[model samples]
Target chain A: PQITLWKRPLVTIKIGGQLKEALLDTGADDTVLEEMNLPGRWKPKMIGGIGGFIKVRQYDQILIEICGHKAIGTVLVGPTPVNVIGRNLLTQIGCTLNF
Target chain B: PQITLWKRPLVTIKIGGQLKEALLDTGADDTVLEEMNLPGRWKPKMIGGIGGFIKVRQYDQILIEICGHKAIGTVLVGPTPVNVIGRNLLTQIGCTLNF
Candidate 1:
């Protein structure tokens, strides 16, 4: 599937056995999700983006599904306005940028 | 151009008559640059993402070149850790996500 940049690249994602929408973020270094209590002990860490930095709980080796494609990667739990699917999982899902 | 999702999709961008490096951020709603003042009538605005909201100056009709493609759109000036080229200008340059 090819997604045009006419809008935010939001797609339905399956994580923790629940479905939600997340943005395919090429610029983001790590996947950041809205606070979800998945089964794991998350290490507290700080991630900085366009604004500044925010403390988040890092959960590694999380399985995420996007458009029927699955990938296991690190997922950050925080107060993000939108859930982001970054390059770590994107690489496994075979996502790419084209022009 | 086809960019694999092996790493951060940083691209060379030309803006305000200068060439600079910026991330092709599909997750970002608007283009935000670091502290370099471009000549324009800017309006005060606030933008948010994974972290939170930040004050920015919205400069409209700004010319930016990415990967030899051109786009005229609103470019924001603010204190961003990285220069981001968002979907606002990406649509103009025909950038898309493919899997």
Candidate 2:
């Protein structure tokens, strides 16, 4: 599949029997989702920081279906404005940036 | 150019006589760079909240060279985590997401 950059590049993704739209973000280092009741146990999220700190629920080995491809990786659930699939999962789905 | 997702898809960029690394972010609608005195003027993001127009210094028709591919489009300057080359500039460089 090939996706042009003309739009926001939102794609359908399935996680824990839930289907939703997510962005394939090459800039994001970690996959982030809006707060949801998802599968897998989560550890405390966030790092030692002051003003620029973001907190979330971090899960390891979470299974996500991107488009039609299945991938298992780390996922973070937080108050993100939008759900995003980052390099952690993108690599599993073989997503590449081409020109 | 085909960039694998195994690592951050960072590319060299030149803008306003500055050479820097930037991410090819398909998910981002507008390119946001770290604070820089760019070639264009400031405009409101309009996606502003009660806290004012999102603090985005929007620039239109700013020239950027991404991996030696010249592109001219909208650019935003602020305290982004990293310099992200978003859809606005990615499209100009003929970048696409492929699997």
Candidate 3:
């Protein structure tokens, strides 16, 4: 119901035994990860979109813990270079932003 | 309201007179483009999450005309290598995913 829940904070997400640094964006209403970052077990689903039919090959309801707060979310598995925090996280945790 | 609108169609999104290929992912609530594909006018805002502090710089709402349909949405500018079709575009145009 609130226009904004929070300004968001930077958090660390562990993927494939690796801890990746990412921003906790309350503005983002979706939870997304890169294809490169995915492990062997998870494979993202390839879907189409702008910029040449984007690839979203893998899906996972990963265990996400933010600042010790935990929740489950479906993340798009991308490559290993980057990670992301999406809106699904904001609604799940009901975060309180700082001024 | 409704669980879905439709299984999105593959469309051509024009950026800088260069139409890059992409997939229209209704599951994704955000629209993302590569930082490299954008012209000098389009800059991205950096955001973070799962894949190791993902860089979502330049927050420009790109004009997306999908499958002959036009809409306005903010696209996270990634590097030039990757282009993504997020849910922002999907929600704009009602879609129903087929199982």
Candidate 4:
């Protein structure tokens, strides 16, 4: 039996803000963070998803550490499940994958 | 001058349906894909994310190849920046990060 796997070690980074320790999912594209603390503080953005059209707000910049390396980038501020480590940050490092 | 950076090689694999070649961002937890073909086909889920609270839909499983490895997983269908590779899949396979 051959089980092909294309996975990476993505850590859920917790921040010192409202949305902390959010899972860093390499499985997703774009930066996403939780914004539970200041709900009203979120700015509106014309965002579309598989479900339908919706509005999203702007968060703040965050510092992330992965595999020992650290990166400072902007995350869509939100609730827990804090920040996701997307390809924007990963591609710059050129990662190796195994099945 | 020291510029800190953390990145990985994330590939965007499009499905036969629609919304292809979307940026793959592992930074994002949970799987997401574009559902532009049939926006009405999405199954709404009361999921909460950054910016504010919203509803998401369930997409389908997809085959992804990374660092040569391939895996099957579910993606939240929506729009471009399709199917993210998260820790759920990345962790199963060990990864190394270089700063």
| Weakest ten-residue segment in model 4 chain A by summed lDDT | A1-10
Q: Candidate 2 clashing pairs? A: none
Candidate 2 chain B least-lDDT 10 residues: B46-55
Would you give me the overall lDDT of model 1? 0.89
Q: What is the Cα-based lDDT of residue A74 in candidate 4?
A: 47
Report the number of the highest-TM-score candidate.
1
User: Which stretches of model 1 miss by more than 4 angstroms?
Assistant: none
Q: Which regions in candidate 3 have their CA more than 4 angstroms from the true location? A: A1-99, B1-10, B37-44, B48-50
Question: Candidate 3 residues B1-99, lDDT tens each?
Answer: 222212223457775556766654433356666654554465535443223335565656667666555667777776423455655665565433221
- Retained true contacts (fraction), each candidate: 0.89, 0.69, 0.01, 0.16
Every candidate's DockQ is 0.83, 0.52, 0.05, 0.16
Give me candidate 2's TM-score against the actual structure: 0.89
Second chain only: TM-score per model? 0.95, 0.86, 0.64, 0.51
Better of 1 and 4 by TM-score: 1
Ranking by TM-score: 1, 2, 4, 3
Model 2: what TM-score for its first chain? 0.91
DockQ (0 to 1) for model 1: 0.83
**Clash count, candidate 2:** 0
Interface RMSD of each: 1.0, 4.5, 12.1, 9.4
Candidate 2 displacement at residue B21 in angstroms = 1.3
The whole-model C-alpha lDDT of candidate 4 against the native structure comes to 0.44
